[PDB]
Design a protein around this ligand. Structure first.
Ligand code: SF4
Lengths: 269, 269
């Protein structure tokens, strides 16, 4: 079973990419589980159709000790099994800690079934603290893909995420499978991202194009593959899916200095 | 001395407003100290004329134990004392721990002097966790201002931040002083920001407009008052300052429901 995690700054469509990627993997005959660990994004909404399914932390406080799997895991588009961690008690508590609670409650309720081809953790990368690195540090996530756009703050976060990955790439076997560009503009910043990823010693595994369809599917609470399998954008996601599935490039990333960041920005951005 | 914290999500210029606000109070003969607690932007880079001061954490790493106050606190614009707590070691440290370390050092090095009119903690609003609630939790900050814009994610963060505020108001002196709008070109933004702040039991203390004045000053790494004092945007900040200094509305905020917020973003465009 591939235990993948998608990290990246908020505000750049990271959860939408993660969800769309799974439909692409489903289009390949894959059995997949998705676990949202992003208190700022609905991680399974495009897969379950507008249903902001109830979180694990929320189910506990009501289903208490007798919680049943089917309450926390809902089957979405194409059979993709969907779950949501739920955030930290506002102002107290640790998101990282609650992502741990949920994951352990999943194993405990036997959610990690031998038919799983994939499990994805959609993790917020705004704060790259020990709380958000929980899935990597605990061995839950071995293969990470970072989502970034050709903007400084998304590149900075990606670099930072790689710093955290790097620290665990040793004791554990977590590695970076690649960077995914979520084009946020008409300016195809393919070259910046490609340079940024190669500099880490990784690769731009796929460049997700700016499309007005992502927005339609989204309004309609669906992934582009559920909403309209025939468009170009649908093929984009199928292509991202196949490259992740076929991927053999797994590395201990080499973070860059801020200065190096700036140089890449100038030379390729 | 007024102990204020400025919370808000990143990506909407919260730190630029913090620095610009202090500038205004400087204009009022106010003696001020700024403590950056936000991994996202440089909370003092505009006060220090574009100077990226080392952080408390960097510094301690460097200067070790023998930490000098003058190394960590730098006087910038009009005498404003600047300090940056430094972010967490990527993948390991909790953002809160560093905040507490820094505040203790400042206290230990006698930075909390009698001549202080204000101390501001510029804090990240992306995750309303205990790590980020450290200035509040440690008692340090009793007066809160949340920076938001018409964007939905900004209002959600603001609402989420108010939950954390309320967790401590009812037992600590912590109160919400108001909502500050960093305008993001939103149709009917003002009426919307005012209904939101009102919904919480608070007020839209000031609407900061977008102007090419801010983008210029930050290319040079200055605050606007500093740039052209005669300038409406610099005057915008002076008004912001006199409105905060004279403020008398300080409340235990009433977080609204997700449905209550979506209603408002429906009713207000
Ligand atoms: S480790 Fe991170 S999520 Fe946990 S309390 Fe600290 S800053 Fe917050």
């Amino acid at each position: 079973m591939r235990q993948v995690a998608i990290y990246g700054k908020g505000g750049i469509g990271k959860s939408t990419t993660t969800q769309n990627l799974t439909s692409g993997l489903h289009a390949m005959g894959k059995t997949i589980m998705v676990v949202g660990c992003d208190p700022k994004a609905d991680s399974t909404r495009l897969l379950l159709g507008g249903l902001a399914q109830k979180s694990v932390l929320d189910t506990l406080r009501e289903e208490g000790e007798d919680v049943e799997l089917d309450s926390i895991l809902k089957e979405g588009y194409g059979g993709i099994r969907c779950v949501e961690s739920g955030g930290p008690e506002p102002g107290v508590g640790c998101a990282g800690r609650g992502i741990i609670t949920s994951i352990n409650m999943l194993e405990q309720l036997g959610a990690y079934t031998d038919d799983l081809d994939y499990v994805f953790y959609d993790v917020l990368g705004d704060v790259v603290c020990g709380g958000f690195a929980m899935p990597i540090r605990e061995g839950k996530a071995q293969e990470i893909y970072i989502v970034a756009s050709g903007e400084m703050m998304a590149l900075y976060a990606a670099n930072n995420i790689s710093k955290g990955i790097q620290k665990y790439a040793k004791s554990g076997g977590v590695r970076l499978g690649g960077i995914i560009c979520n084009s946020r503009k008409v300016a195809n910043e393919y070259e910046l991202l490609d340079a940024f990823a190669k500099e880490l010693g990784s690769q731009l595994i796929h460049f997700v194009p700016r499309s007005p369809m992502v927005t339609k599917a989204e309004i309609n609470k669906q992934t582009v593959i559920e909403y309209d399998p025939t468009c170009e954008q649908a093929e984009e996601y199928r292509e991202l899916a196949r490259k992740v599935d076929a991927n053999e490039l797994f590395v201990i990333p080499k973070p860059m200095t801020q200065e190096r960041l700036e140089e890449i920005l100038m030379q390729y951005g």
